[PDB]
């Protein structure tokens, strides 16, 4: 609710 | 001659082992696939929040990914990646929710970057449904639409989805479980 | 040393006996996944109808469930039960057939009690397809439809849905099969 | 065809 | 007693074998079911092709089949069945691409002949995006769409599709990979 | 495309 500039989460994927 | 036997026995412990282990990953592939939607939805059901919330306090699982979920058939694959003690600037204080692109098998006939608007969602469990969630329009410059190149892109969403103390003074957890959702347009195409 | 032999062989044989058994079991689970159906329309075939009917007659099996439908990807969870010799009112003279509420991973986020209405059909294999069924809207007040608190709720439905002798004298049987349809109006949500 | 009033079978789900 | 232990290693190594088979037939049986549809629309990916045109050339593997898809979840059951190097009139100058009807567990409910219009494909992975494809009505008096009595029909469809050349050297194929598409009309019914 | 006529393929099916 509080997400008006979705961002990346810190970094890393697999 | 007791060399020969032991080796047999030993070759077939091993193959039992192997076995085994194809079982477990096996029954891992039926809940996956038993779980799939193919409609641009997605509903993740976490139990075990308390333990888990702590096993991301600690440090040992920071975080969980959904089982994946499709537009369409054959269409993009994705799923949810949730932070239970929350990410970035949400850390300690929220419960953070990201949106994840996967490689698709179908990767080569989409389009690219991913650009279907994404909604977010904590589900309400009480009498009163009051659904938290919001929803983006995926930025194009952003790696994170990109067509895939390793196994998943870099998540994105909301490191700032809930606070810790509105969800978990809610009625949003109950028996111990929270439910996520995700809703991707797909009106848009093919 | 044939004690240690013997010992590591007999290990060895109740592993073989447990993975003979979950493979069996793995055989089941991808039946009933690849019988599943998400849009409230369950087609159930029962083969092998004379020799079941007679296990029915004789008590060694009186009733059989359907592979479980849903009315979308995390809906309901929903099967049929029939008794080919019949029950209550219709036993020895009538089939049977009965609706079930399943318990369902996602019966938090759903109405209760259930009340979307049901139809229960047989097929008429023949030429003419003069399909046999009756539908209900469920009543609130039936234990059939309260939010799980078992596996399955009791079955509700119509102890004398067709007279055995019409069943064996149509052509509803064919090639010692029959053909039973439940529909489930989903219309109505989410 | 002849289920007007929709019934319980006779006790035993599971 | 070693001919006692040599029998029972034998019996395992046995039974060890038939498991390992079972397992690598469940894993066919996943990817089948992981990769189906429900509604009338195939996407076929087929990998390798270099291997596989040559394969076809060399009369190793000349026909390809698709896995299974359905008009429905109790419907009709279909696939494509492809030609590499070409068949019939098409031998050694173009791919040719067949329709398939199989023999499905609900054939007993449906119409036949099998009359839906069918529409095959090769998708154009270049960013044009030019798909080349025809349809066709399927012609009651052909045994292509009769009802099933082996496991599947007789093949129907184009044996001069696409042109080798044509195909290899415009963008039909990326990555060593082509995708075929069928679909077929499923708004006639049930 | 050039599937004016749609044909059978030569022969066997299984």
Known sequence: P????????????? | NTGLLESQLSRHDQMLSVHDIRLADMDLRFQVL?????????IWKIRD????????????????YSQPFYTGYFG????????????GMGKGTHLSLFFVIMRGEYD?????????????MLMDQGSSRRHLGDAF????????????????????????????????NGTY??????????????????
């Open chain 1, 2 to 14: 509080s997400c008006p500039k979705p961002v990346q989460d810190t970094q890393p994927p697999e």
């Open chain 2, 76 to 87: 993009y694959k994705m799923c949810a990646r949730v932070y239970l003690n929350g990410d």
């Open chain 2, 137 to 168: 329009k995926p930025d194009p410059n952003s790696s994170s639409f990109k067509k895939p190149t390793g196994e998943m892109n870099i998540a994105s969403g909301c490191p700032v989805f809930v606070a810790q103390t509105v969800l978990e």
């Open chain 2, 108 to 120: 080569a006939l989409l389009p690219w970057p991913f650009k279907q608007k994404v909604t977010l």
């Open chain 2, 49 to 64: 929040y308390k333990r888990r919330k702590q096993e991301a306090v600690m440090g040992k699982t920071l975080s969980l």
């Open chain 2, 34 to 42: 038993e779980t799939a939607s193919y409609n641009g939805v997605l």
């Open chain 2, 173 to 190: 957890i109950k028996d111990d479980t929270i439910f996520i959702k995700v809703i991707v347009d797909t009106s848009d195409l093919p």
